[PDB]
Design a protein around this ligand. Structure first.
Ligand SMILES: CCCCC[C@H](O)/C=C/[C@H]1[C@H](O)CC(=O)[C@@H]1C/C=C/CCCC(=O)O
Length: 1152
């Protein structure tokens, strides 16, 4: 496990101490505090000492070219007799080999420790972020959604890992440049400055690119976040989007977000491609200008000078034109993270109640609670009652102390428990979610479980109450998680219970069972302040408080094959472009090798010669080799991005069109998060990291092949050692790779519980903060953070274990080239050896990176496969057929079912059979029956959500013989759950612009909603809150009624919806629906039978068969009818009223 100096608690507490200290100094000054200053003051002392590695390592990198000059010098002055020289030359090859091993170790030590340093910063920052989140002020939480905080950990803090890697090169790079300039000066004189002048033009330009890249990346994130939030509501709402046929509107909305987003990605990618192209060509330019100026100044090319100089510039090429720019960009990216984090860190952060008045926000036109005056004492039940918005839940929040008085006073005695109306549940076992860290005891537990009506589900769960649960309770039903949430509070045996209408979360039988056995009986000794709409229970309450107008008013995977690679490339461009993509890659490297070979050839030719070389020839071909290198290096870089970004564009469009036409069965099988991960996570890789990692891999891979090719071209005998040395690499790689994918698997699975704990906590915050549970919930995060730290730690160490041994076989290659040249020295010339050795030394950093990036590519291809499979989903029958209805159709509104059979899957059971019925024009019909009898399947048949067997007719057209959008648009659905989609009210009422603004207000008047919209500052064009949060559920259902009122249609289907409205407004829309749709034929699924008893017929489903379909009075006068038995099951008063109503209405409807 992770040792104490890396453990979450210790490591986050340290930086927090410096943050609090910096706040105090800023407050003593005038200035705003700086989180960057706190980080430096925390970590500088341990980070600076790592600079010793870079100091010694870079000193070695400048010495190693000087040794190489003395080895090459043996071939220039060669004499086969003079053994004393031969022994000395063997001495330098030993020193050069020692340099190579020392340099390899120092490089691995430095890069190891800076990567630990970055890990610690991340771990400390996550601890700070989570510690803040518990304490956020209840009003200041309203301006930052849970997903925005979770994005801090997911995206923003993961930058700090990268920041620490390159910072030392901000000084070591420039200093090395100065030293390298001084070294070159002794070797090639003033011509040194020509190469440095290029270098000091590159430095600003590459730094500006890094700044401008960061700005584009920041401006892109807004579109990506908007696309993901929109795509989340598409995937979550997909049945409603289908039934309204609104697919065209979300296609347009996602299309244009993606079209904006992809344009910034392209530009961004070209910038980043230009940066990495610069690193490729930089030395080739620097060397070109240096030796071009050198020969115009009258100097002559000699092998020793060239390859020493080439090797020195190679040092500068890493530090100044790769590592220094990488620092600037990653520091730039750091500050955007620090800025967003700082803004979060600076966010705001017996019972008696008398004169109590309070504001949730002083900008409110009134206090949000006012003048409350009541008290309650042990043994009493207080019921809190009143309309919507009367402040009932605010009263509980006041007694809980989350809402302090602006006037009046509150006091409480004994232990407090609070139960929120929305259920909350976390991971662990469901019993653990009930115990909440208390000790288990059967004797209290069984009493709690039976009083909470919860026993049956804890038996039927697949491992009972020891079933493991998801971090937000997604593994439980609403009624289960509600009772689990209540059972937790009831287990606490508290003295004051604050109950925010948990009874509203469950069915009426369960509600009274909870009220009787728990609230009345088990809690009998205790103060209960129960908010509930269960006003029918009030006879049992000891006292009753009625609120109105805000005041008191009354009192009483794993592996991927070649097929995925071919598809990924070919999806982006025609194969002709891909062949050209390969060719420019080869040509880039060939020109790159040939430029260095040309210097070697020129050095050899100068050695053969008074007479002198024709500079127009040698300097001419030199200039063409360089220019071709530059041109292909640029084009190669850009074209990789063009193809791979175009591939992501094509695969997104194909995937999105598939998900739109995919049948609902696809979403019944795959949970929402698993689909959305393709769009957010997998396409995120394809847009960003994957194209860069391909270019990074391809560019290094070709250079490794270039080094080995150069060596075998000069010293063919190397092919003999290279066979064993190759075999060793294959065995080593084979052995590593399997453990490599084990730790990448382990790393992934250990990361996700961290983010899932933050989101779990943020939803539950009114619970965990109530029971004083902040300390325990910190240690839970520290545990998950610590377990992830092990897998990350193992990933780091295993990566270095591998890389160290790859550098051992690289060092054997260098040793073979260095001594092999001295053994074979009769046969090969100084410029050949200088070429071969110079190339061999470059291998040391390069080869281990090439082989590790290979695994990165392989690992990310799993994302590519996971999206390609979604391009191949089965499709619904098309939107419009070759046959199409006449525009007058439908016109009567006949529907017929004839021998209809339905199942949700072809291998699934039938859930409607032989269903055969007529629905006449302007007739009114209700659907009734048992739970699971098939009621929901009747909608699914008629909308063809799954294709029925048999015949369905609408106005004598078979619904199978017309397009889905012909059918779906000519019907109107009022769904049970409302949805308001993000956007304006105008879009939510009309996404296609076919109703006039006059008509839209006429609709908004007829639903009696206009005034509350005119109170909004932008009126109909105002942006609604996410999910409609600025409206209650009943208010949102008014907007669904408005859509149906606007869309003129003959046939209306009502999905049991109005019973979810508040009773004083359920009755209102029930009245409106009778008024407005008098001209329609009407279908209505309903539980609250009193809402349909008037209808001309009712349909009763027993189980998959339509057993009754008749006039409701004619049903009820059959006392043996299922419909009678159902109303008889409601209760005597209900059955009397219903039967009386049926008799009266049936008589009246027989009079005409
Ligand atoms: C972030 C760099 C992206 C581009 C890299 C480029 O394609 C290759 C650079 C090679 C170069 O040829 C020699 C060398 O040492 C580089 C690899 C080092 C990268 C830093 C992390 C090293 C380590 O962790 O061991």
């Amino acid at each position: 496990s992770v040792l104490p100096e890396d453990r979450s608690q210790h490591l986050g507490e340290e930086l927090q101490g410096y943050w609090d200290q910096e706040v105090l100094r800023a407050e003593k000054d005038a200035r705003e505090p700086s989180l960057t200053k706190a980080i430096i003051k925390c970590y500088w002392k341990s980070y600076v000492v790592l600079g010793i590695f870079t100091l010694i390592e870079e000193s070695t990198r400048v010495v190693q070219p000087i040794i190489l000059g003395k080895i090459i010098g043996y071939f220039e002055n060669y004499d086969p007799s003079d053994s004393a020289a031969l022994y000395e030359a063997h001495g330098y090859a030993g020193v050069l080999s020692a340099c190579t091993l020392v340099l390899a170790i120092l490089h691995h030590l430095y890069f190891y420790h800076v990567q630990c340093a970055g890990m610690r910063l991340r771990v400390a920052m996550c601890h700070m972020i989570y510690r803040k989140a518990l304490r956020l002020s209840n009003s200041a939480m309203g301006k930052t959604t849970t997903g925005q905080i979770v994005n801090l950990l997911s995206n923003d803090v993961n930058k700090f890992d990268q920041v620490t890697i390159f910072l030392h090169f901000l000084w070591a790079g420039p200093l090395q440049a100065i030293v390298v300039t001084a070294l070159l000066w002794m070797e090639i004189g003033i011509s040194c400055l020509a190469g440095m002048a290029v270098l000091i033009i590159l430095l600003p330009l590459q730094s500006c690119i890094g700044k401008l890249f960061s700005s584009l990346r920041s401006k892109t994130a807004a579109f990506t976040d908007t696309r993901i939030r929109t795509m989340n509501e598409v995937i979550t709402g997909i049945r409603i989007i289908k039934m309204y046929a609104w697919e065209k509107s979300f296609a347009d909305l996602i299309t244009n977000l993606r079209r904006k987003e992809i344009s910034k990605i392209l530009r961004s990618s070209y910038l980043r491609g230009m940066n990495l192209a610069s690193f490729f060509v930089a030395s080739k330019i620097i060397v070109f200008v240096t030796f071009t100026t050198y020969v115009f100044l009258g100097n002559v090319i000699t092998a020793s000078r060239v390859f020493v100089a080439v090797s020195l510039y190679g040092a500068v090429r890493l530090t100044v034109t790769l590592f220094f720019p990488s620092a600037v960009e990653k520091v730039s990216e750091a500050f955007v993270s620090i800025r967003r984090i700082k803004n979060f860190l600076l966010l705001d952060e017996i019972v008696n109640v008398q004169d109590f008045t309070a504001f949730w926000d002083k900008a409110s036109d009134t206090p949000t609670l006012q003048s409350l005056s009541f008290t309650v004492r042990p043994g009493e039940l207080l019921a809190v009652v009143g309309p919507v918005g009367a402040g009932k839940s605010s009263l509980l929040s006041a007694v809980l102390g989350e809402l302090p008085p602006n006037q009046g006073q509150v006091s409480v005695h004994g232990r407090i428990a609070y139960v929120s109306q929305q259920p909350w549940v976390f991971s662990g076992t469901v019993r653990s979610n009930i115990l909440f860290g208390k000790k288990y005891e059967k004797e209290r537990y069984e009493k709690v479980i039976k009083a909470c009506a919860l026993k049956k589900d804890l038996q039927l769960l697949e491992d009972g109450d020891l079933t493991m649960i998801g971090d937000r309770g997604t593994t439980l039903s609403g009624g289960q998680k509600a009772r689990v949430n209540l059972a937790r509070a009831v287990y606490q045996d508290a003295d004051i219970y604050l109950l925010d209408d948990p009874l509203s979360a469950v069915d009426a039988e369960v509600s009274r069972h909870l009220f009787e056995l728990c609230i009345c009986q088990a809690l009998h000794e205790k103060i209960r302040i129960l908010v509930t709409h269960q006003l029918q229970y009030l006879k049992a309450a000891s006292q009753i408080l009625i609120l109105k107008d805000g005041q008191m008013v009354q009192k009483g995977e794993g592996k991927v094959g070649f097929k995925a690679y071919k598809n990924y490339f070919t999806a982006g461009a025609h194969w002709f472009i891909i062949i050209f993509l390969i060719l420019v890659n080869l040509a880039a490297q060939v020109s790159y090798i040939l430029q260095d070979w040309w210097l070697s050839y020129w050095a050899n030719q100068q050695s053969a010669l008074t007479e002198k070389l024709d500079l127009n020839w040698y300097l001419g071909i030199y200039s063409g080799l360089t220019a071709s290198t530059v041109l292909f290096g640029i084009v190669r870089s850009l074209l990789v991005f063009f193809v791979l970004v175009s591939s992501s564009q094509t695969l997104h469009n194909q995937m999105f069109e598939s998900i739109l036409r995919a049948p609902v069965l696809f979403f019944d099988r795959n949970p929402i998060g698993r689909i959305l991960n393709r769009f957010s996570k997998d396409i995120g890789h394809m847009d960003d990291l994957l194209p860069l990692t391909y270019l990074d891999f391809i560019q290094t891979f070709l250079q490794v092949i270039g080094v080995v090719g150069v060596a075998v071209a000069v010293i063919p005998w190397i092919a003999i050692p290279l066979v064993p040395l190759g075999i060793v690499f294959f065995v080593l790689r084979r052995y590593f790779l399997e453990t490599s994918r084990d730790v990448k698997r382990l790393e992934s699975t250990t990361r996700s519980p961290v983010f899932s704990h933050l989101s779990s906590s943020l939803q539950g915050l009114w619970t965990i903060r109530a029971y004083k549970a902040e300390q325990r919930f910190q240690e839970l995060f520290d545990s998950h953070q610590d377990l992830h730290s092990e897998a990350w730690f193992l990933f780091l160490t295993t990566s270095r274990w591998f890389a160290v041994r790859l550098d051992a076989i690289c060092a054997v290659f260098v040793i073979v080239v260095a001594f092999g040249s001295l053994i074979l020295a009769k046969t090969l010339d100084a410029g050949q050896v200088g070429l071969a050795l110079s190339y061999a030394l470059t291998l040391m950093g390069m080869f281990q990176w090439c082989v590790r990036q290979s695994a990165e590519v392989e690992n990310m291809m799993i994302s590519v496969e996971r999206v390609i499979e979604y391009t191949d989903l089965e499709k619904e029958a098309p939107w419009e057929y070759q046959k199409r209805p006449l525009p007058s159709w439908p016109h009567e509104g006949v529907i017929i079912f004839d021998n209809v059979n339905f199942s949700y899957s072809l291998d699934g059971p039938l859930v409607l059979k032989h269903l055969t019925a007529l629905i006449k024009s302007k007739e009114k019909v209700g659907i009734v029956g048992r739970t699971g009898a098939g009621k929901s399947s009747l909608i699914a048949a008629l909308f063809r959500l799954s294709e029925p067997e048999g015949k369905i007719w609408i106005d004598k057209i078979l619904t199978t013989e017309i397009g889905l959008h012909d059918l779906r648009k000519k019907m109107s659905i009022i769904p049970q759950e409302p949805v308001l989609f993000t956007g304006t009210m105008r879009k939510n009422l009309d996404p296609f612009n076919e109703h006039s603004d006059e008509e839209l207000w006429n609709a908004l008047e007829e639903v009696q909603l206009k005034e509350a919209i005119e109170d909004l500052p932008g009126k109909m064009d105002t942006e609604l809150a996410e999910s409609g949060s600025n409206f209650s559920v009943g208010q949102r259902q008014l907007v669904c009624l408005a859509r149906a009122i606007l869309r003129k249609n003959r046939i209306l289907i009502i999905d049991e919806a109005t019973a979810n409205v508040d009773p004083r407004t359920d009755e209102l829309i029930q009245k409106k629906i009778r008024e407005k749709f008098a001209h329609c034929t009407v279908l209505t699924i309903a539980h609250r039978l009193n809402t349909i008893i008037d209808s001309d017929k009712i349909m009763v489903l027993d189980s998959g068969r339509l057993k009754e379909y008749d006039e409701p009075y004619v049903l009820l006068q059959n006392r043996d009818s299922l419909f009678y038995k159902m109303v008889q099951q409601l209760g005597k008063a209900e059955a009397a009223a219903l039967t009386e109503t049926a008799k009266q209405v049936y008589f009246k409807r027989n009079y005409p």
